[PDB]
Design a binder for this molecule. Structure first.
Ligand SMILES: *[C@H]1O[C@H](CO)[C@@H](O[C@@H]2O[C@H](CO)[C@@H](O)[C@H](O)[C@H]2NC(C)=O)[C@H](O)[C@H]1NC(C)=O
Ligand SMILES: *S(=O)(=O)CCCCCCCCCCCCCCCC
Ligand SMILES: *[C@@H]1O[C@H](CO)[C@@H](O)[C@H](O)[C@H]1NC(C)=O
Ligand SMILES: *[C@H]1O[C@H](CO)[C@@H](O)[C@H](O)[C@H]1NC(C)=O
Length: 279
């Protein structure tokens, strides 16, 4: 009976699609293996898998969230609650969904390598001992925060410059909004706390996401881009603008970690740590 099965909604990462046998499709089958009967819905933004991949890079995130919200609404099997799992950027997009459209009600949210505080660095380009890598990211500010670019580029919409944070607060059309940087949105806080379990999976040896702490809602300490601080230590948590400190208090936040590069997980680990939150 439906009580037993809780529907699962999946949102893929950048460069991926909803239904490729080697990636989403593979998680879809693994989940169907152990959760008999579960109804899985792998989101597809666009009419074809060609527009899907393309949209993961070039379609305004805010516009994608409105679209998926409409999709979840038109699906009857979801109206009584549904778990969601986001891979990579799919993690923060799905969190936006949770904060913006509370019906149907999302239950458990699984973030597999998501960037909740965005990013500030290029993949495989560590700025510690590299002048060129550091130069770029810092110089891409004017680019990333340009009005036109900030609306036609997905990754720009969650690019978070810690040095010139005022510009990021004033120009980010996505991450800054769902992160309450300008003003505390009441429905966002309440809608996020309405979740039962928010799981943040983080790959300890990630070289694609800079900084890796963003996977556990942490980030570079303001004013610079070398040292990072944990969520519990940031003012988002301190003033509890999203209800993240209250939730943590109530045991609604789970911090998972495992050795590996971005999105590197075995069929075993997946069975031993993710399937639970779905069964
Ligand atoms: C993967 O790379 C990380 C480096 O990011 C290794 O480091 C672990 O975590 C931090 C740094 O991330 C270190 O201070 C710890 O000492 C490391 N953990 C251990 C085992 O002590 C991590 O060990 C690497 N593991 C793999 C897969 O190579
Ligand atoms: S996942 O594969 O969906 C996760 C995304 C991980 C971070 C990698 C994205 C790096 C984006 C670099 C571009 C920033 C854009 C600046 C544009 C200025 C013109
Ligand atoms: C919160 O955000 C929503 C979605 O953008 C917006 O419509 C609304 O005006 C904001 N305020 C509240 C508390 O709903
Ligand atoms: C963005 O908005 C703030 C608040 O009005 C104001 O200081 C200015 O217009 C912008 N801030 C900076 C320095 O980017």
């Amino acid at each position: 009976d439906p009580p037993a099965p809780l529907p699962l909604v999946i949102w893929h990462g950048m460069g991926d699609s909803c239904c490729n046998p080697l990636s989403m499709g593979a998680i879809k089958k693994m989940v169907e293996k152990k959760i008999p009967g579960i109804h899985v819905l792998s989101l597809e933004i666009g009419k074809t898998l060609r527009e899907d991949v393309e949209n993961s890079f070039f379609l305004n995130v805010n516009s994608q969230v409105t679209t998926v919200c409409q999709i979840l609404a038109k699906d009857p099997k979801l109206q009584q609650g549904y778990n969601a799992m986001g891979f990579s950027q799919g993690g923060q997009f799905l969190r936006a969904v949770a904060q913006r459209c509370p019906s149907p009600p999302m239950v458990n949210l699984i973030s597999v390598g998501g960037q909740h505080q965005g990013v500030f660095g290029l993949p495989r380009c560590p700025g510690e001992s590299s002048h060129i890598c550091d130069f770029i990211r810092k110089t891409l500010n004017a680019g990333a925060y340009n009005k036109a670019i900030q609306e036609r580029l997905v990754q720009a919409e969650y690019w978070h410059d810690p040095i010139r944070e005022d510009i990021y607060r004033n120009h980010s059309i996505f991450l800054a909004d769902i992160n309450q940087e300008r003003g505390v949105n009441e429905s966002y806080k309440k809608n996020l706390m309405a979740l039962k379990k928010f799981v943040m999976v983080k790959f300890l040896n990630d070289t694609i996401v800079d900084p890796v702490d963003s996977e556990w809602f942490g980030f570079y300490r303001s004013g610079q881009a070398k040292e990072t601080i944990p969520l519990q230590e940031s003012t988002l948590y301190t003033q509890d603008r999203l209800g993240l400190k209250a939730m943590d208090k109530a045991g609604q936040l789970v911090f998972l970690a495992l050795e590996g590069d971005h999105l590197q997980l075995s069929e075993e680990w997946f069975y031993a740590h993710i399937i639970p939150f779905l069964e």
